[PDB]
Amino acid sequence: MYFVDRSKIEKTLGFFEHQLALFDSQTDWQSEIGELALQRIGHLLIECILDTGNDMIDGFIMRDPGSYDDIMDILVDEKVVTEKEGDELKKLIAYRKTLVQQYLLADSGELYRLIKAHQTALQDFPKRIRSYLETELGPVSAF
Amino acid sequence: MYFVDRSKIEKTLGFFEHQLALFDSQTDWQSEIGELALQRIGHLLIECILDTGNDMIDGFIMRDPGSYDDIMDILVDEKVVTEKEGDELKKLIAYRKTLVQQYLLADSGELYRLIKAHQTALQDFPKRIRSYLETELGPVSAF
């Protein structure tokens, strides 16, 4: 019934958690080098959420997203994450265009505050995904 | 005849030179934070080249690209950069997919080697662009 790219998802969740751990580390984000590292972390956190969300939606025959911005709303509808978690994650996702397209405008202090403000929802995201996977597919299989 | 986004190009070159100068520093790019910073730098350098390329092509009514490889090839065709500079920059641009899409596979050691190998072509890129702008538009005007 469901063909879920579980290897890809669980891979990307591990990667995500590593980057979050690094965010929670004792850096100097105010460095030059610190600013650049924080931009990469922000970009990676966002991409991992979007990619995982797409893989979830495709695998579990959820409503198709019109744009990457619709992904969280669908995960909320499907009770993958809470409404409040979804709204919080959306606020970080809204930074994507600045990071990838309007990069002259990227502001690492702003981005720090954004990630910090939603750190609990970020930490919980892999847990939500894994619980859903375990509930729907069991402990081992992608199908 | 030509309406070129010279202010966008010039500000983009400035930002590019700034990131390139951060690369040529005494920094440990192998640390967890350093690795992330270098990835951001690599991404930024690539995007600056492609965006400036696109702005040059649009402004000067050059051939419409159907590829990123095509952007550099068109700049070569139009005598903006040398054939060899074009080739060298395409080798860095070849890493974009890894940095932006297949980011689980990003290897900051591979990236360091890529940027180092083509450092001169990178340093000369803004010079090439400014020289073309000066010749075609004069020292002041965008049009």
Round to whole Å and give the CA distance between A47 and A40. 11
Write the residue in A32, A40, A47 that is nearest to B22 by C-beta.
Answer: A32
CA distance A118 to A81: 14
What domains are defined for chain B?
2-143 (1.20.120.580)
Whether B4 contacts B142, CB under 8 Å = yes
CA nearest to B57, candidates B12, B119, B94, B66: B66
User: What is the count of residue pairs from A and B with beta carbons less than 8 Å apart?
Assistant: 48
Q: Which of residues 29-48 of B touch A (CB under 8 A)?
A: 32-34, 36-37, 39-41, 43-44, 47
Helix axis angle, A6-23 to B32-59, nearest 10°: 110
A105 close to B (CB below 8 A): no
Task: Decide if B20 contacts B123 (C-beta within 8 A).
Answer: yes
Per-residue b/e over A25-39, b at no fewer than 16 CB within 10 Å? eebebeeebbbbbbb
Place of tokens 């395409």: B90
Residue with tokens 């402990």: A139
Q: Rounded to 10 degrees, what is the CA torsion of A81, A83, A87, A89?
A: -10
Residue A142 to residue A7: CA distance in whole angstroms: 8
In this complex, the residue of A12, A40, A103 whose CB is nearest that of residue B36 is A40
Q: Position of tokens 């990123």?
A: B68
Of A11, A33, A39, nearest to B34 by CB-CB distance is A33
- In this complex, do A33 and B32 lie within 8 Å of one another by their Cβ atoms? no
- DSSP annotation of A2: -
Q: Rounded to the nearest 10 degrees, how much is the dihedral formed by the CA atoms of B91, B64, B102, A27?
A: 80
* Known active-site residue A96: yes
- Residue B98's nearest CA partner among B34, B23, B46 is B46
Q: Are A46 and A96 in contact (CB under 8 A)?
A: yes
The reply to whether A67 touches chain B by the CB within 8 Å rule is no
Tell me the one-letter amino acid at B135: T
Residue A37's nearest CA partner among B74, B30, B136, B102 is B30
Sole residue written with tokens 């199908």: A143
Radius of gyration of chain A measured on its C-alpha atoms: 15
The full length of chain B comes to: 143
- H or E segment and range at residue A137: helix A119-137
Catalytic residue (one of A63, A96, A113, A128):
A96
Q: How many CB atoms are located within 10 Å of the residue A75 CB?
A: 26
Q: Which amino acid is at A114?
A: L
DSSP state of B64: P
Residue A131 · residue A82 · CB < 8 Å: no
3 state SS for B67-135:
CHHHHHHHHHHCCCCCHHHHHHHHHHHCCHHHHHCCHHHCCHHHHHHHHHHCHHHHHHHHHHHHHHHHH
Residue A106 backbone class (left: φ over 0; alpha: ψ -120 to 50; beta: rest):
beta
A22 has a chain B CB within 8 A of its CB: yes
Burial grade of B21 (CB within 10 A; 0-12, 13-18, 19 or more) = exposed
Residues comprising chain A, all counted:
143
B64 touches chain A (CB under 8 A): no
Element at A30 (helix H, strand E): none
Method for structure elucidation: X-ray
- Cβ-defined contact of B12 to A36 (cutoff 8 Å): no
Q: What CA–CA distance (Å, rounded) separates B58 from B64?
A: 8
**Cα–Cα distance for residue pair B81/B74, rounded to 1 Å:** 10
d(CA A90, CA A94): 6
Inspect the interface and report whether the beta carbons of B36 and A37 lie closer than 8 Å. Answer: yes
The CA distance from A46 to A89, in Å, is: 9
Q: Say how far apart CA B45 and CA B122 lie, in whole Å.
A: 8
Side-chain half-sphere exposure of B79, counting CA atoms within 13 A:
3
Distances (CA, A) of B122 to A66, B11, B23, B117: 38, 16, 11, 10
Distance CA A62, CA A83 (A): 17
Tokens encoding A132 = 């859903």
The CA-based angle B84-B126-A32, given to 5 degrees, is: 115
